[PDB]
Design a protein around this nucleic acid. Structure first.
Ligand SMILES: [Mg+2]
Ligand SMILES: [Mg+2]
Ligand SMILES: [Mg+2]
Ligand SMILES: [Mg+2]
Ligand SMILES: [Mg+2]
Ligand SMILES: [Mg+2]
Ligand SMILES: [Mg+2]
Ligand SMILES: [Mg+2]
Ligand SMILES: [Mg+2]
Ligand SMILES: [Mg+2]
Ligand SMILES: [Mg+2]
Ligand SMILES: [Mg+2]
Ligand SMILES: [Mg+2]
Ligand SMILES: [Mg+2]
Ligand SMILES: [Mg+2]
Ligand SMILES: [Mg+2]
Ligand SMILES: [Mg+2]
Ligand SMILES: [Mg+2]
Ligand SMILES: [Mg+2]
Ligand SMILES: [Mg+2]
Ligand SMILES: [Mg+2]
Ligand SMILES: [Mg+2]
Ligand SMILES: [Mg+2]
Ligand SMILES: [Mg+2]
Ligand SMILES: [Mg+2]
Ligand SMILES: [Mg+2]
Ligand SMILES: [Mg+2]
Ligand SMILES: [Mg+2]
Ligand SMILES: [Mg+2]
Ligand SMILES: [Mg+2]
Ligand SMILES: [Mg+2]
Ligand SMILES: [Mg+2]
Ligand SMILES: [Mg+2]
Ligand SMILES: [Mg+2]
Ligand SMILES: [Mg+2]
Ligand SMILES: [Mg+2]
Ligand SMILES: [Mg+2]
Ligand SMILES: [Mg+2]
Ligand SMILES: [Mg+2]
Ligand SMILES: [Mg+2]
Ligand SMILES: [Mg+2]
Ligand SMILES: [Mg+2]
Ligand SMILES: [Mg+2]
Ligand SMILES: [Mg+2]
Ligand SMILES: [Mg+2]
Lengths: 64, 76, 51, 96
RNA sequence: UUUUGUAUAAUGGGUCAGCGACUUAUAUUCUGUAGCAAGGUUAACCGAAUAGGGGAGCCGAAGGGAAACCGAGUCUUAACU
RNA sequence: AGGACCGAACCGACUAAUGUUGAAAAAUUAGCGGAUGACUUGUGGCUGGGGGUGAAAGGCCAAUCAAACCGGGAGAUAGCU
RNA sequence: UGUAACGGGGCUAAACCAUGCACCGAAGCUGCGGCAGCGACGCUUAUGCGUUGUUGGGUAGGGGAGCGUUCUGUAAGCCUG
RNA sequence: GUUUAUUAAAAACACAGCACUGUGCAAACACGAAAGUGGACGUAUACGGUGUGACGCCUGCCCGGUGCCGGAAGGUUAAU
RNA sequence: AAUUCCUUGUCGGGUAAGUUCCGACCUGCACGAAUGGCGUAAUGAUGGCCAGGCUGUCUCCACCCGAGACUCAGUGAAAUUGAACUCGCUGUGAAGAUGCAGUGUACCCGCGGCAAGACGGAAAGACCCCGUGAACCUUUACUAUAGCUUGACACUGAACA
RNA sequence: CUUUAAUGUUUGAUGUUCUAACGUUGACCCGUAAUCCGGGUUGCGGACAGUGUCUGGUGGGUAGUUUGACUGGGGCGGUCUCCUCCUAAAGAGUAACGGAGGAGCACGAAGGUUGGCUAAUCCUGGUCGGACAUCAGGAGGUUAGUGCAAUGGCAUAAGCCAGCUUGACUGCGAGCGUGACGGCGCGAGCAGGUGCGAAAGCAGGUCAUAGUGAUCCGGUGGUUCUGAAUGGAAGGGCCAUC
């Protein structure tokens, strides 16, 4: 039968033009008042999944 | 009372040594106080990190009446 | 422990706010500070309100 | 995705976004597609008939991809700046 | 066989003969190989039945953005050196 | 008269030896307790498994009962050997 | 438990220190013959061969090349009273 | 008297006796989705549950905790 | 003390000598009144202690009668078993050796006996720990639930104050 | 209308009776040579009891499960994240139930800037005044101070005061450090706007290093996003925050 998407992964990663994955930074959900504005600024933009983690993400998203 | 504790090591120390060519912005030494002071084309960050303000070669010197240590950067 | 989170609100129409903390015992009055409002892109007076 | 018990990467990180139902009935057209339709007139219908866009597509954009070497009359389609320059260079026509 | 390490006084086998354990289906990706190539391929089904018909679909030649949307760009920001 | 006394049958099972690949998957020999009683025994009946029954030992319920036996879920699961 | 604190016999050096030259001694090194992996280049590449340096212990494990068994085609062929 | 049929027969279980406590009878209690039944063709000198354990001499103090019994004013409090 | 750790408590009695026994003391680690206290004749294949008789229980074993064991004839198993040409000692060594080193000793093969060794046989240690195993049991652990109980509505109406 | 009483009404509140739903495990009749059942008569009760749905309480009676790891075996004790020092072998890192301590905050000034200033300790003198308060001189020279542990810094002070103040700014970021990762850190410079200074300039919090909690779900505000026929709306996204 068809492989099943790990559906929670599919709500956190998106495949980019050269085959990597973009994702949202952790730590910008709450407990924000104490966090420097600088630090939070740099968590806003999306980031790329690291080399160590691509195997894991790709395993979870066979149809990405 | 009981012992058994310590903290994570902070990896302080010299990152670029004498003669090394660096791009501007590169951290040259992480330190807790100013063991080393910022010289020409070198800046001091809030945790006393010394960094390059210009592309060039790292240069350690001893200067002034207190025989203090300074890191500067020479154009190459 | 006693230090409470408050928000400083822009006195312009905008609903922009900064967030900070306060010792409400020792400092019972309203914290009020000029700060930069990124929506009208100017410095304006900001006034404490509840988080 | 299992990592031994550690909060795994796909839970560590936050969810983002929503899905646009509109994107799915919106297609892109290449310049190389404009000659492949019988009649030199490019509509939603024409493109469907020539099998270039899906049957349920309700909006389409001609983009600067490939080339167009024949006069074409595009119609009821959005056209990119580049594509408009390319379509018109080859004697073509764009209209709402 | 298991172990850092077994002649080990650790495990297993009295001996022989026959049997006895990485398969199969469907998805998916990579390598090798073959076909065709900005295209490749059809599925159910029809059938003249391993042909031929069937291009419904699917993957690919376009990305960026949460999205609207713009598009060889796009997003970020009032705007980017 | 008596859940009276001694003592065979009958019911039981305190001690020891033997036996322990037994004559026997619980016995045999020598001794032992009850023996008109809350006694003992034949035939048939009723109670059924989280259920029975239990003068209560988790005892017994067809030779292993802190949850019988058979068939099924069934190739349960086994990060162990 | 039995010499049992040179492995033994035995040694007054066959012990110890010093100098020296000889010899024994390994699957190390050389010599002769041979196979293969990787290179390189040749007489001359349809791709193996021929020269030529070098390499060739190995568990878990990865890679490469093969043998043999049963069945289908080749096969109404080929072998076989 | 009973008991661990098959390593324990005993000081263990039971026992007559004692106490507490429920139960007005379509009883309480128990087996049953129910119907039906046991209790009992009994009826408080009866029936159930709990503890103690012939008999003799006896059985003192504690109601804060936990359990149970009784209470209605006040607070709090469900569906609606 | 079926209860006492210290403990063989201390004192007395019994014995030549008594960590048990009986009697007493009270310093009750940690008795006590129906979780019953303290007594109690009788009963008891019940626990502890003493004495008479009795004796192979013992000093210390002897003789004897029978069933086996032994021999012949007939029938004819078993557990176990990697392969055996299957000695001692001291040492070495996965650290307790028939098998290794050194050395001693030993012609080849049975039968009756003995159990020091083959870490002998038998049962994938029951102790101990581990597994995000199993079960049954407890409770003011968690979550539910039968049962019991509360009230609203339904079956459920009328008259009169 | 000022007000008051009483006959007429809706809904309750409460009560007293009634009979007709319903109960009868009282007597009788028939089906019927029947201690079941049904119909009928009669007596006793009676809108109660009981049952259905909903609901609060009770509920080891039953059920399904949980009840951590590290550990010189386990258990008891202790410990589990973070900061500082030593062990640590002169770059980084480096273990033990090794040796010592600390954090889970504070501060609208204890932040920014301009301008200024300089400790500890001892000797001598001095009302009350003492070993030690405040005053003067001298020695001393940072041994002081740093909101707090330790270590490294600190005089150009980073230590101490005052004036003006909100840079404890918003968008970004060349280039680096440190991480398996999630992440965490340092950063000149660019745009907008601001404070202080005559100016050069300084300021994106605090001498630095602890002072912390991923994701999910949900709340609040904002919004040129989305909006299941269409216009809205709900819900979702995005930004801020809890
Ligand atoms: Mg948010
Ligand atoms: Mg199509
Ligand atoms: Mg071992
Ligand atoms: Mg060996
Ligand atoms: Mg062995
Ligand atoms: Mg074996
Ligand atoms: Mg075989
Ligand atoms: Mg009798
Ligand atoms: Mg007998
Ligand atoms: Mg008798
Ligand atoms: Mg019978
Ligand atoms: Mg199954
Ligand atoms: Mg199985
Ligand atoms: Mg000798
Ligand atoms: Mg010599
Ligand atoms: Mg040799
Ligand atoms: Mg060799
Ligand atoms: Mg028995
Ligand atoms: Mg017995
Ligand atoms: Mg009793
Ligand atoms: Mg009492
Ligand atoms: Mg009450
Ligand atoms: Mg005696
Ligand atoms: Mg006594
Ligand atoms: Mg008796
Ligand atoms: Mg004889
Ligand atoms: Mg014979
Ligand atoms: Mg052996
Ligand atoms: Mg054994
Ligand atoms: Mg085992
Ligand atoms: Mg009622
Ligand atoms: Mg309910
Ligand atoms: Mg409960
Ligand atoms: Mg339970
Ligand atoms: Mg389960
Ligand atoms: Mg453990
Ligand atoms: Mg170091
Ligand atoms: Mg070093
Ligand atoms: Mg300060
Ligand atoms: Mg100054
Ligand atoms: Mg003085
Ligand atoms: Mg000015
Ligand atoms: Mg809302
Ligand atoms: Mg709609
Ligand atoms: Mg709509």
């Amino acid at each position: 039968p068809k492989i099943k998407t790990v559906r929670g992964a599919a709500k956190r990663f998106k495949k980019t033009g050269k085959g990597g994955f973009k994702h949202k930074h952790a730590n910008l959900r709450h407990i924000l008042t104490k966090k420097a504005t600088k630090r939070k600024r740099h968590l806003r933009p999306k980031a790329m999944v690291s080399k160590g983690d691509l195997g894991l993400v790709i395993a979870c998203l066979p149809y990405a | 009372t009981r012992n058994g504790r310590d903290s994570e090591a902070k990896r302080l120390g010299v990152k670029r040594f004498g003669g090394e060519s660096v791009l501007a912005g590169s951290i040259i030494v992480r330190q807790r106080g100013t063991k080393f002071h910022a010289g020409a084309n070198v800046g001091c960050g809030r945790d006393h990190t010394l960094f390059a303000k210009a592309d060039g070669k790292v240069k350690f010197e001893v200067k002034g009446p207190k025989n203090r240590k300074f890191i500067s950067i020479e154009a190459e | 422990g006693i230090r409470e989170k408050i928000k400083l609100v822009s006195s312009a129409g905008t609903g922009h706010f900064y967030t900070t903390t306060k010792n409400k015992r020792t400092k019972p009055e309203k914290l009020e500070l000029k700060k930069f409002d990124p929506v009208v892109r100017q410095h304006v007076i900001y006034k404490e309100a509840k988080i | 995705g299992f990592e031994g018990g550690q909060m795994p990467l796909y839970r560590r990180l936050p969810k983002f976004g929503f899905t646009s139902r509109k994107a799915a009935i919106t297609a892109e057209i290449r310049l190389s597609d404009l000659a492949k339709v019988e009649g030199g007139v490019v509509d939603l219908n024409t493109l469907k008939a020539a099998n270039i866009i899906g049957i349920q597509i309700e909006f389409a954009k001609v983009i600067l991809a490939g080339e167009v070497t024949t006069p074409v009359t595009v119609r009821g389609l959005r056209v990119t700046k580049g594509a408009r320059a390319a379509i018109e260079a080859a004697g073509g026509k764009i209209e709402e």
